[PDB]
């Protein structure tokens, strides 16, 4: 029995914990994983102060060659808008990028905006102040929500640009996608981002979003699947699954990756990080579809099997896998 530690991104921790339960339960093994953020991961497996590195926002090529890391993603999320609008249930809401974007940037300070009203032409919207949420320090969250954004809204791209970290034109900082969760649920009018498994579990509500393909979606499981159908994982596993066409296309979405050293000095503990991930390849995509993750294709483990073969060593270039 093996004690393994990782640590980074809250985007997956809900199901991180649950696999790493379960296969406790089944194996002995313990897995402890830190929620505290993509950037702070990425510092840690770097500072090799844990067994793996998680986050959402993946390290070029180049950067993971210069730190003899390997990536690889685990499972599919979304990231939603959950508001605290009263006189509103969840779902009913819609907003398209350039709304929410101008929303973020400060330029919609009411629920009542003509610009919500037009596209939510029979809601009874209420003229509360908004109050914006956004995560406080380093966040992969905060990375794909930019990115998508960056995308949908000139203005954002050209004054705030993309990234884990970035100046706010206003909002009040939460830590974690738990700490937005808690924010959005205390203030009324708060609109904040978090993975959905985030809203679901404190039932909050959250918003429909219009589609690259012009369409309202609902967030659920399938369509961030859908979101992916797309995605040329034979070319590399750094997909940007933002804004997808496609029907049903949930256009905040992201896989998120785990990052472990390619030249293992404690190989028995990297044997085990892989065995874990290995077993939930294997045996975990129920308990990701219960938390509303979506598995990644078959191929596409196959292709991250075969990569671990080739990629992971001890320091005598024995393979790990
Ligand atoms: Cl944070």
Redo the contacts with the bound molecule.
Sequence with gaps: EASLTGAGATFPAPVYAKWADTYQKETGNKVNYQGI?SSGGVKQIIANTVDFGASDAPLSDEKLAQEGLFQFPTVIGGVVLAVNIPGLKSGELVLDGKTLGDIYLGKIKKWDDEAIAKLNPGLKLPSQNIAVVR?????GTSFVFTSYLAKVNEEWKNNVGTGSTVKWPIGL????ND?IAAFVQRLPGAIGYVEYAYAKQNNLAYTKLISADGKPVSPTEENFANAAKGADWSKTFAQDLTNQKGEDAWPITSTTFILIHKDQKKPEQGTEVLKFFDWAYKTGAKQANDLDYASLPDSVVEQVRAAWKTNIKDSSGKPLY
Aim: hydrophobic residues 10%.
């Design positions: 953020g995560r406080a320090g380093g966040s900082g939460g830590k974690g700490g």
